[PDB]
Structure formats: structure tokens, C-alpha cells
Amino acid sequence: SGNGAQGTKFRISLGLPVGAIMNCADNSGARNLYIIAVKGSGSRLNRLPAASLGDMVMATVKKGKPELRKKVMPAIVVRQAKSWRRRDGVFLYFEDNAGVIANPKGEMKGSAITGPVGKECADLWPRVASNSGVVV
């Protein structure tokens, strides 16, 4: 949330607390991402900060290039795998959790995205909409 956010976002259910791992859907050389923070999250005692489809997060790369490992970087969630409600009543989910690497103001370090992405992420990040093929 924040800098590169084109618009707002409706609440959709949280599925990615800190310490979670989600696959990397782009071609930047990273295989998975490890979530350690969520931008826009509040502060309650013992609550884990938790991310949803379309949220920006701080991540580290555990498997991938040494150029990218061992440093924290921003990322965006594009698939959730938890069921979330759309205001048209549709509960839907993917079969995996996934995100992409990005810079703070919304741009991607990659050039392409494997697999589908959420419309609630395409709406909020246009550079993700551009490099996305299938939007569901």
C-alpha cells in the first residue's frame, strides 16, 4: 500500500502472515519470497502482520540468485490461495501463494509474470497489469 497505489482496495481476507513463503511469479531470478512485513498494517499485541492479494510487503529471497539473496526488498502479492470474497458474492482462491519483486513506487524488477493474477492487484499496480497475461 502507499506510494505506487493507483487507488484503494477493498478488504480481502488475510492469508500471508510474516514468516510465510510464496512463490515468485516473475523472471527476476528468484524462486520464492519470504514475507517479513506488510505495508499498511496496524499494531495489535501478538497479532502477526499479514498480507493479502494486492498488498505490498517486504520480503527476502531464500532460493535464487546470490545477487538477490541476503537482502530485504519490496514485493507485491498476486495470488493468495486463501478464499476471499468479492462484493459480487464470489468466493475464490488460487492453488498457490505468489508474488513479484518490485520497487517501492510500484515498478517491477522483472519483465513477465507466470500464471494468473488477481484483478484487485492489476487495478492497484498497473506495471503488474502490463506484465500480466491473465487476470482473474
Binding site: 487507488g7 477493498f10 495489535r44 499485541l45 501478538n46 462484493r87 459480487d88 458474492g89 487495478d123
Partner: protein
């Protein structure tokens, strides 16, 4: 010491005591501020919660992503048969508050409202309002003077009504009685309206209208003696905890050497009287009409009643109020609706609502069909049918 990590009070110290209500019918503790210019009508109605269903509608919000796009919402249905008027009373003002000086009743009371005055009806002469009924039949003497007393005093007038419980599928037979405050004008005209409506009924269309925001006042579902974890929302203590984990560890300090009112304790959950505001009416429906569940877009002649009935209630052969969202109370429970105490513009209390579709599939399952004819046309003929 200086609690290591700050965090908010679990619960609201304003819905105390979390005690059982005195009655099953919650009491309206505030009616709207009056305007002595409008015509005379009620400010509240009585009905019975039936259940819920699902509603699809096109949204009208200039600025939302879902503008002029279809969204599905939850509503609740209140069976609201016509409410009978039996009596009024006159509250006048004192330095000790409002105070009633007279209760005027009607001549013929029905055998479903003169049960409310009994705890054992099956053995009784029924002998109620027999002398008050003979107080009539000399032209208007002992009644018109009382009404004149009300006109001569009584800054506030309230109408006593009773529900027609015998029209619902409930097995209760004992009508609910209640005072409802009129907010027309000219207390003389108020009481004259009442006198005209004695022994007569008021429909809900005369009170409420579509897109009107209301408040629901009802006693909430009872759950019993509950522990602190679910009652107040405290942490479960960890696993390796002797003498329980569904508790509150520290219930106070050595000094003040007492347990404080502010500490979460175990006790009653539910059967509280609650009052929930700003619930939009999405339909006002008539029992003198099939196609209560039909719309401009669907146009299939079906009632609001789902398949198999409403669960634990029945059918909705009477009038009803389809209102947005979840309201206090469980099914079969007397709700009292109330017009709002303030005009809320807000661009959400003014959205004019037109429904597209209504869910009449069974709530006794993962209901596939909305209609028996739909079911027959899909499944085809069966072994039962010829």
C-alpha cells in the same frame, strides 16, 4: 509496574451489565424528537424475525469500483402483520420526568390480547375488561371525558397496540402489547386519530417506506453462562497451564484490594436488549400479493418464502420488511422497528434501491434450486411423479 506492552480493554464497559433482560420484548428507550407539523402516524412497529436470505442489486455510488455493477448482500426478513390499536395513554411532564395519568382502552379487546393479562388462560372466566366494556354503552361519558383529560394535559401521547400473533405460524397465541409514540401534531388530533383507529389495524406501509433507514430493537440470542474467553474476548492462556487456560490470569492487583468492575468475569452471554441503527429497508412487502419475491428483472411469480420454509419459522403469508444486514435477535423473536432519530444523508442512506433477484432456495441445505418448477425442469420426471 508499567504494563510491558500496551493494549486495549477487551470489551465495552457501556453494555454492562451483561445480564439477562427483564423481558423478551425489548423496550424503546427513545423515540424520535417530535415535529408538530406533519400528519399523524406511528414511529415504530412490531414484528417477528423470520430469518435471512440473499439479495442481488446494482450499486449506485459515484466513486466506487462497483458503481453500476451488481453486488450481492445479506438481508433479514421481519414478518409484520397488521398491528391492532387498543388504547392510548397520556404522559405529562414533571420535574421527575414524564408520567402517565390515564390509560384509555377500546371496547372490544380480542382474545389474543386479553391473554397477555393472564398466566393461565385455560382455567379462567376470562373476565377482563368486562366492566371497562360496560363503561361504554352510555354514549361516551366515562371515556370521552378521559380523552378530554388527555387533550387538556399530556404533552406526549402514546398508542397501545397489539400484534396479530394468530396470523404467524407460531404456537404462542399470546399477542405482544406495546406503547408506540405518535409524532404527528396537535395532541388533540393525535388522540382523535387513536380513537378512530381503536379496534382497527395499521399496516406497515403507513409507517415505513423503501430506502428508509431504521433502527431495530430486540433481545439478542441467548447462549447462557459463558466463560470469559468468548464472553469478553480474552486470550486463551497457553497449553502448559495448570487449572485451566480459558481464564483471565490476573483479575487485579494487591491494592486496590478488590476485584474491579472492569475485569472480565464469567457469566451470562446473550439475552441482552440491543439497539442497532441505520439498517436500510430494501423492500416493504405485501401478503395480498404473490410475487413478493419477484422483481423488475427476474419476473418469476414466487413469494419471499424459500423452499422448505424459513428454518424454524415457517411461511411469510403476511406483510413483511426486508431490511439490510444482520439485526439483533434470533428467529421467532419479537423485534420492534423504529424510525431514525436523525436525518442521515451520507450518500448511503439516500441510495435508492431496486432489487434484481432474491434467493428463495432452501436454507436447510446447500439448496440448488429456487423454485419447484425449476427443480422439475432440471431433474426431469422422477419415480414418484406419473
Amino acid at each position: 509496574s508499567h504494563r510491558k506492552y500496551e493494549a486495549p480493554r477487551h470489551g465495552h464497559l457501556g453494555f454492562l451489565p451483561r445480564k439477562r433482560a427483564a423481558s423478551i420484548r425489548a423496550r424503546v428507550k427513545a423515540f424520535p424528537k417530535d415535529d408538530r407539523s406533519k400528519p399523524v402516524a406511528l414511529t415504530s412497529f412490531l414484528g417477528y424475525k423470520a430469518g435471512m436470505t440473499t439479495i442481488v442489486r446494482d450499486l449506485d455510488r459515484p466513486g466506487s469500483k462497483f458503481h453500476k455493477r451488481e453486488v450481492v448482500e445479506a438481508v433479514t426478513v421481519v414478518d409484520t402483520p397488521p398491528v391492532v390499536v387498543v388504547g392510548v395513554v397520556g404522559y405529562v411532564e414533571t420535574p421527575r420526568g414524564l408520567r402517565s395519568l390515564t390509560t384509555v382502552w377500546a371496547e372490544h379487546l380480542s382474545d389474543e390480547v386479553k391473554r397477555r393479562f393472564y398466566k393461565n388462560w385455560y382455567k379462567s372466566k376470562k373476565k377482563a375488561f368486562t366492566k371497562y366494556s360496560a363503561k361504554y354503552a352510555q354514549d361516551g361519558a366515562g371515556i370521552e371525558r378521559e380523552l378530554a383529560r388527555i387533550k387538556k394535559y399530556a404533552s406526549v401521547v402514546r398508542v397501545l397496540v397489539h400484534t396479530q400473533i394468530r396470523k404467524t405460524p407460531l404456537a404462542q397465541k399470546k399477542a405482544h402489547l406495546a406503547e408506540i409514540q405518535l409524532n404527528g401534531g396537535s395532541i388533540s388530533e393525535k388522540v382523535d386519530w387513536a380513537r378512530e383507529h381503536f379496534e382497527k389495524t395499521v399496516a406497515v406501509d403507513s409507517v415505513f417506506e423503501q430506502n428508509e433507514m431504521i433502527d431495530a430493537i430486540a433481545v439478542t440470542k441467548g447462549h447462557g453462562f459463558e466463560g470469559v474467553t468468548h464472553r469478553w474476548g480474552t486470550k486463551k492462556l497457553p497449553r502448559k497451564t495448570h487449572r485451566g487456560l480459558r481464564k483471565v490470569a490476573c483479575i487485579g492487583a494487591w491494592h486496590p484490594a478488590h476485584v474491579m468492575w472492569s475485569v472480565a468475569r464469567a457469566g451470562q452471554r446473550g439475552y441482552h436488549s440491543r439497539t442497532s441503527i441505520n439498517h436500510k429497508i430494501y423492500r416493504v412487502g405485501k401478503g395480498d400479493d404473490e410475487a413478493n419475491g419477484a422483481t423488475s428483472f427476474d419476473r418469476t411469480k414466487k413469494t419471499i418464502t424459500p423452499m422448505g420454509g424459513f428454518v424454524h419459522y415457517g411461511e411469510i403469508k403476511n406483510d413483511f420488511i426486508m431490511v439490510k444486514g444482520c439485526i439483533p435477535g434470533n428467529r421467532k423473536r419479537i423485534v420492534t422497528l423504529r424510525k431514525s432519530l436523525y436525518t442521515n444523508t451520507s450518500r448511503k442512506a439516500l441510495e435508492e434501491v431496486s432489487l434484481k433477484w432474491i434467493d428463495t432456495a432452501s436454507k436447510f441445505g446447500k439448496g440448488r434450486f429456487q423454485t419447484p418448477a425449476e427443480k422439475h425442469a432440471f431433474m426431469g420426471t422422477l419415480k414418484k411423479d406419473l
